[PDB]
Design a protein around this ligand. Structure first.
Ligand code: PY5
Ligand code: PY5
Lengths: 396, 396
C-alpha cells in the first residue's frame, strides 16, 4: 500500500527546526519559528504558569474526560478576552467556545464544521499569510483564494488592492482576517480601516473568520482586539480561532479556542452542536493541562496580575530588539534603509530579503530565517545582534 | 449561514454524561462511559502519575514546540510495549510512531493519511463496535462496511460468520481489529484465531488496522499484545492506534499514538513524512504533558514498577466486580443466567438488555448504561451493587 507514497515536502517553518538542530556550528542563529526568547536566548516557562501548575499538582483529583467543548471557565474567560466583559455577545448568549489543540486545531475544527454544515466552498486568505492556512483549509475540502495585502515598495497596507481583490469574493464566502500582528508582514489595519472592512463585509455578505494568535503583542490585550470587536458589533455571525501559545508561552501544551457567534442563543446552540460533532470525529475532547493553566491564571487576581506583567515584558523586549536591529544594521554598514522594521508589530518582521539571500545566510552564516524573508525579532538578543547583522550586510 | 444548521444527535456514549449530571436524584448510578472507578466510586489520578508530574514541575525548563511526531522517548516506549523489546520491527527500523491527541486522534490521523496518500476507499469495522469508529472514518471520506462478530445466542465469537463476512473484503481494503478487550462485547479471538486471521489477511491483501485502547486490562501488558504481534510477524505493512487513557488514567490529557509499519525503513520514512503532513494540517504538534508523564514513567524503573502494580490492581478489581455482579444478580432473583459476563474481558460487559429495558433503567431507576446494553463493570462498587442489581431484575 505504501510502496508508491511520495515523500512530502518539508514545512517552510517547521522543517527549519530540523535543519537547525542537525546543523553543527556553535554560532548558528535561529530566527525561524515564532517562539519568544528572553535576553539569554531561552524560551522559559512563565512564572505565573509554574505557579498555576503547582496549584494543579496539589489540587487536581482526577483526569476524567473533559467534555467535547472543554473547561467552561476557560471558555468564559476567552470570550471576555476577545469581546470585553460588558459585551452584548456575552449577555445575549450569542457565542459558544470550544477548547481546541491550539490555534491550528481551532482553524481545522472550524474548517471541518464549515465544510459539512455550511454551503461555503471558498476561503479568502491574505497574500502573504501563514503558510499553514491553506493546508488546513484544503484538508477540509475548501478552496483558498488570495487577496492583496502588503505593498512591498512602501512597506504599507495596500488598502486599495485589498478592497479591489476582495471585490471578487461572493456572498457566502469566508474571509480570514488576522486579529493583530499580521503574520508575516507585521502590518495591521487601523481602527478606521477595520471599521471600513466591517461595513464592506456586512454589505457583501462575507463570513468573517479571525485568526487571533498574538493577542497582547502589538499594543495590549484590549487594544489588539479593537478590530474584531468592531466586526462583532456589526455582524450577526463570525468565527474566531484564538491561541494561547505565544501570550502564555504554552506552545507544546496546545491551548487554543474556537469561538462561534450567531444571531441568537437558539441558533448558536444548534450550530455549535454540529461543531461538537466535528470535534468528536477528530480527537473527542481536548487536553486539560494547558487549558486548566490558562483558566486558573485568568480566574485568579494575583496570578493574572503577574501574567499580565510578564506579557508586557515580552512585548517590550521585542520592541527594544527590533529598534536595536535597525540601528545595528545601519551601524554595521547596511546600504538599504530598514527603518520600516520599527513600524511593524508582533514577533516578526518582513526583512525584504530575497530567497537566495536567505539561503546564503543559512548555508554560509548559520543564520536561520524563513524563505520569505521573515525573521523572528523575538529571537534576537543583544549578544547575537552583532554577528547577525554582519551576516545580513555581507549578503545585501 | 447558520440559520438552517440542524441540531446534531447526541453521542450514545458521551451524550450520556450530559443527562447523568443533569439528572438530580442522589442514588443515580453511572455505568456508561469507559472510565475506571475504584472501590470508593472515584476515578483518581494514579500515584505514579502524581510522581511524574512533580518530577516535571521541577525539571521542565520550557514549553517550546514538540515537533510533529512528539516526544521521541515516548515513541520508542510504545513500540516496545506493542512489539516487545527484542522485536525485529524495532531492530530493522520498520516502524514510526507519531504522538497524538488520544486513541481517537490516532484513528483520525491514520484515516486522513490513508485517504490522501493511499487508494483505500473502504474500512471494515466489526458488528458491534465502538460507535465513534464509523464517525472518524466517515469524516475522512472512507466508507465503512461491517463484519459479523458476536454470537448473541451463545455469547461467543462467531468465527465462521466473521470469516464469511470478511470474504467480501477486497485486496487493498482496511480491516479494523480490536487488540484486546473488544468494545463492547468483551469477547476476543484466541491466539489460534488470531494466527488464522493473520494468514487470511496476508492472502487476501488486507491492510490491518489495530485499535489498542485497553492494553493491560485483559490478561497483561505482554499477553494482550499477542494477536497484534502475530500479525506483525507476517505483515509487511500495518497501522496501530493505541491509547494511554485507560491504562494510565490519563483520560483528559489526550495521550495516544499512531504507529506505522512498512516493509523497510526507507519506505516507512516516506510514508511517515506524509502522515506528518496530515498532522500539520490538523493540530500541528501534540500536547506534551500527558505524553511526558507516560515517557517519564516508562523510562524510570521505580516509577514503572509502581505503575504496573497500579494497573494490575485496576484489572483485578474489575474482575472481582464482574464476578460479584453475576452472583448478586442470581442472589437478587434474576431469571436469566448471566454467567457469560464472567467470560468477558475489559471494563465492559454486553448485558444483553434491550433498548427499552435500558431506557426504563434510566428513567425509572437512575441507572445509566449504553442503549446497546453495554455497562461499565469498572463503575460498579460493592456499595452500588445491590441497588443496581435490584433495578436490573425489576426490568427483566
Ligand atoms: C508552528 C508555527 C508557529 C508560528 N505560527 C503559529 C500560528 C498559528 C497557530 O499556532 P498554535 O497552533 O501553535 O496555536 C495560528 N495563526 C498564526 C497566524 C500563527 O502564526 C510561526 O512560526 O509563525
Ligand atoms: C469517550 C469514549 C470512551 C470509551 N471509548 C474510548 C475508546 C477509544 C479512544 O479513546 P481515547 O481517545 O480517549 O484514547 C478508542 N478505541 C476504543 C475501542 C475505545 O473504546 C467508551 O465509552 O467506550
Amino acid at each position: 500500500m505504501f510502496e508508491n507514497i511520495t515523500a512530502a515536502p518539508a514545512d517552510p517553518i517547521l522543517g527549519l527546526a530540523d535543519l537547525f538542530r542537525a546543523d553543527e556550528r556553535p554560532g548558528k542563529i535561529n530566527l525561524g519559528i515564532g517562539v519568544y526568547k528572553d535576553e539569554t536566548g531561552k524560551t522559559p516557562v512563565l512564572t505565573s504558569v509554574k505557579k498555576a501548575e503547582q496549584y494543579l499538582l496539589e489540587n487536581e483529583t482526577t483526569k476524567n474526560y473533559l467534555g467535547i467543548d472543554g473547561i467552561p471557565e476557560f471558555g468564559r474567560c476567552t470570550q471576555e478576552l476577545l469581546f470585553g466583559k460588558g459585551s452584548a455577545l456575552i449577555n445575549d448568549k450569542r457565542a459558544r467556545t470550544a477548547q481546541t489543540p491550539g490555534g491550528t486545531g481551532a482553524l481545522r475544527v472550524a474548517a471541518d464544521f464549515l465544510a459539512k454544515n455550511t454551503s461555503v466552498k471558498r476561503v479568502w486568505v491574505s497574500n502573504p499569510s501563514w503558510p499553514n492556512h491553506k493546508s488546513v483549509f484544503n484538508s477540509a475540502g475548501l478552496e483558498v483564494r488570495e487577496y492583496a495585502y502588503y505593498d512591498a515598495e512602501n512597506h504599507t497596507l495596500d488598502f486599495d488592492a485589498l478592497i479591489n481583490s476582495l471585490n471578487e469574493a461572493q456572498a457566502g464566502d469566508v474571509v480570514l482576517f488576522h486579529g493583530c500582528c499580521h503574520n508575516p508582514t507585521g502590518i495591521d489595519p487601523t481602527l478606521e480601516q477595520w471599521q471600513t472592512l466591517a461595513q464592506l463585509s456586512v454589505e457583501k455578505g462575507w463570513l468573517p473568520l479571525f485568526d487571533f494568535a498574538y493577542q497582547g503583542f502589538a499594543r495590549g490585550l484590549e487594544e489588539d482586539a479593537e478590530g474584531l470587536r468592531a466586526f462583532a458589533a456589526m455582524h450577526k455571525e463570525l468565527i474566531v480561532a484564538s491561541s494561547y501559545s505565544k501570550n502564555f508561552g504554552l506552545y507544546n501544551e496546545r491551548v487554543g479556542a474556537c469561538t462561534l457567534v450567531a444571531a441568537d442563543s437558539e441558533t448558536v446552540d444548534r450550530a455549535f452542536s454540529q461543531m461538537k460533532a466535528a470535534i468528536r470525529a477528530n480527537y473527542s475532547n481536548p487536553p486539560a493541562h494547558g487549558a486548566s493553566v490558562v483558566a486558573t491564571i485568568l480566574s485568579n487576581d494575583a496570578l493574572r496580575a503577574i501574567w499580565e506583567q510578564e506579557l508586557t515584558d515580552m512585548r517590550q523586549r521585542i520592541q527594544r530588539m527590533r529598534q536595536l536591529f535597525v540601528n545595528t544594521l545601519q551601524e554595521k554598514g547596511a546600504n538599504r534603509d530598514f527603518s520600516f522594521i520599527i513600524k511593524q508589530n508582533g514577533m516578526f518582521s518582513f526583512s525584504g530579503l530575497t530567497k537566495e539571500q536567505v539561503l546564503r545566510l543559512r548555508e554560509e552564516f548559520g543564520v536561520y530565517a524563513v524563505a520569505s524573508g521573515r525573521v523572528n525579532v523575538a529571537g534576537m538578543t543583544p549578544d547575537n545582534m552583532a554577528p547577525l547583522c554582519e551576516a545580513i550586510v555581507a549578503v545585501l
